[PDB]
Symmetry: D2
Subunit: 216 residues, 4 copies
C-alpha cells in the first residue's frame, strides 16, 4: 500500500501562549528514499505572532529511508496507520505537547495534528521571531512498552548568532502493534524552502534516513 | 460584575496517550469565599481509559479568596476575563499541556479548555486508574513578564499506598493587563464528591485561599 | 541528647563552574523553637566568584519546630544522626548536587558538606552576583523508600528587581529507620544578617516550622 | 605536546546515595586515532553498593579523533589543559554532577574527578546493580559562552532486557580561550572489557570520533 511516490494532506489545530490558529497543507515524497516536500497555509489565526520554525517538525516519518535489517515500524503500520505524540522542552521554559493521527485514504496519507505550546517568554526567540531554521539532527530510538520511542537534542539557529536549544521526546504508536526495531538512529534535515512575507504560506523539504550507530 | 454567588459553564476537548474525549459541565460557587462545586459529564470518548484525577484541576481560580492587601489579578481581569496555561510534569514521564479561556457572558462565567497528555507509561498509575485523589496543595505565585505565574508540587494518593508526584507550572494572563500581586501563596483542596461507576459523570468541590507566607 | 539550646560546627568542600573552595563555620540555636544562627568563613578559594546565596541553604533541619503529632524524623535520628542530599535545578540551567553528614560530638552537632555546582551561565545572576537573598519558602515533604523527601519552589530576589527561580529536591536519611511523618509542610525563612565586602565572612539566621496543610 | 601515544593517571572521589568512595587508575591510548583503555581500582569504600556503569564515563575526551576541519578544542588546550563538568539526569530521578580537571605532567595526562550522585531509588537498577553496559552513543556539541558544550541521550542495557535512560549534559572549559568548533557530533562506544567479582578492579576500552552531521 505504500508506493514509491506518495502524497499526503495535513491539518493542524494549535495554540501558542493563548494564540489559536489552524493550518492546512499537503505534501509528497518518496517514502523508501527518505525525501519529501510540504506546502502549508495558515487558514485561521494568521499572521502568526511566533516563529514558524516551532511548527515545521509537526507537519511525516513514514518517509524515513530504512535499511532492510531495521524494521520500519511506521511503514509496517499501514494501511491502518499510526499515531504519534511529542513533548518539546525548550531551554527558556517553553513546552509543547503534540498529538497526531496518521491514516491512509485511497492512496493518500492523511495527517491530523493538535498542538499546545505554553510558557514561552514574551521577549524570547519564539515570540520575537528570532529563529533561522533548524540544524540537521540525529534522533536516538528504542522500543519500549510495545511502541517506538525517540529523543533528539535539536537546535534553532538564532538571527543574532548562536543556538536556541530544544529537546524532543516522541512516541510512535501503531494502531495495531507491528514489529519493532532495536536501538537505532535517524538522521534528519528539515529546510524551509520558500515563504511569503508573513509566513502564512510556507514550503518545506525534509531528508531523513535510519541507521545503526556507526561503530556497530 | 463578580457577584457573591456566580455560576460557570465549562467544556474540554482533550487527549491522553492518543485517546480523544470531550467533557461538558457546569459549576457554581462563592468567588470571595474561595469555595465552589462542579459537575462534569463525558460527552465523547467515554468511558475514559485513564484516571479522572489528572482532569479534575482543569475544570476556576477566579473563586480564590484573597485578602484586601493582595491584588486579585484574576477577578480584576473581568468582565473581559483571562486565559490560563499549564504544564503538568509527572514523575514517571507523563507530560500534559493545557490552554484555557475564561470569559463572562450575562453573569455566567464561560470556560473553554484544551488538554493534551502524552508519554504516560501503559502500566503506570494514570493508565491503570490507580490514583485516589489529590493531597491538598500550596502554590507559589509571583509576577513575571506582566502576567501572573505559579508552581506547585502536587501528589496523587495511590490505591496501594504512597504518592504519585506531579509538578504544576501555570500561567494566568489577563486579556487586558491588570494589577499584579507580589510573591505569595495559594492553599487549595480539591475533592471528588460523587461519581457514577465509570466516572462519566463526576462532581467536585474545591476550596482555595490566597495569603502571604506565614513568616511575613 | 538534643537540648533546648544546641551549637553546631560545619565544614563544606565545594566547587562551582570549576572553582574550588572550602568553608568552615559554627552556629547555634533552639531546636524545639525552630530558630538558629550561623557564622561562616571561606578558608580556601576566596573570594568566591559567585553568589553566596546558593550556599546559604547548605549550612540544619534538626532545628525545625515540629508539633507533637508530626514525627520529628531528624531529631529522632540522634545521637547517631542522619545524612541529607539535594538537587537544586536553577531556571537558567545551573545544577547543584549536595551531600551532607550530620552527627553529634562534644554535645555539638557536626555537619560535613560536599557541593558540586555546574552549568551556570557566565553572565547569569549566580556568576555575576546579582542576587539579594531568598524569599521565605514552603517545602512539601512525604515518606518514600524508607526515607523522608521534600521539594520546594524557591526564588532568589534580583538586585534590580524580579526573581531567579530554583527548584529544590531533598532527601533526608536517618542512620537508623526512626519513625517517618506523613505528607506535611515546612515553612522556612533564611536571612543573611551581615557579611564583609567580599563575602568571606557571613552571618545567617533561619526560622523554620513544620505543620499540616492549613485546610486540614 | 600530545604524542601519537599518551598515558594517563586518574583519581576520583565520589559519593552515591550517601556512600563515599575513592578510585584510582591509569590508562593509555592513541589520541589522534580515538582509542584508549583504562584500568581502575576502588581504593576506599569498596565494594561499591551500586552499578559500576554510572562511573565508567567519568574516567578522557582528549582522545577523540577529529578531522582537520573541526577544531579539536580539547587537544588545543594543552599543555595547560582543560576542565570538564557534567550533569547526568536519570529517568527514575537519580541525578549526578561531576567536576574534573585535566592537566599534563611529565608527558602524562593527569585527571582529577569529583562526583556526587543523589536521589537514586533504592530498588532501582543503579542501587540493585541491574545494568550491563552502555549502548554506543552520539553527542551533539556546540560552542556557547566561550566554551564547548555537548548533550547526549544515553542508555544502560538492563540485565533482563530493555533500557534505562540517562541524559548527559557536559561542559568543556579549556584553561585558555583556544579555538572552538561549530555545531558537530561525537560518536563514542565504551566497553567494560573485564572486571573482578565485586567490581573493585575494572578495565575499560573506548572508541570516539568527531564528525559533521552525515547530511552535510
Amino acid at each position: 500500500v505504500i508506493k514509491e511516490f506518495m502524497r499526503f494532506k495535513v491539518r493542524m489545530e494549535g495554540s501558542v501562549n493563548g494564540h489559536e490558529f489552524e493550518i492546512e497543507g499537503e505534501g509528497e515524497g518518496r517514502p523508501y528514499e527518505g525525501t519529501q516536500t510540504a506546502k502549508l497555509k495558515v487558514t485561521k489565526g494568521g499572521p502568526l505572532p511566533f516563529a514558524w520554525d516551532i511548527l515545521s517538525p509537526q507537519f511525516s516519518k513514514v518517509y524515513v529511508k530504512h535499511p532492510a535489517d531495521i524494521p520500519d515500524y511506521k511503514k509496517l503500520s499501514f494501511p491502518e496507520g499510526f499515531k504519534w505524540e511529542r513533548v518539546m522542552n525548550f531551554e527558556d521554559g517553553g513546552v509543547v505537547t503534540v498529538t497526531q493521527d496518521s491514516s491512509l485514504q485511497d492512496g493518500c496519507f492523511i495527517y491530523k495534528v493538535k498542538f499546545i505550546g505554553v510558557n514561552f517568554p514574551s521577549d524570547g526567540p519564539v515570540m520575537q521571531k528570532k529563529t533561522m531554521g533548524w540544524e540537521p539532527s540525529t534522533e536516538r530510538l528504542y522500543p519500549r512498552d510495545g511502541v517506538l520511542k525517540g529523543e533528539i537534542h535539536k537546535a534553532l539557529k538564532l538571527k543574532d548568532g548562536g543556538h536556541y536549544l530544544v529537546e524532543f521526546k516522541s512516541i510512535y504508536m501503531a494502531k495495531k502493534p507491528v514489529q519493532l526495531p532495536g536501538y537505532y538512529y535517524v538522521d534528519s534535515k528539515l529546510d524551509i524552502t520558500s515563504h511569503n512575507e508573513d509566513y502564512t504560506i510556507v514550503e518545506q523539504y525534509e531528508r531523513a534516513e535510519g541507521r545503526h550507530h556507526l561503530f556497530l
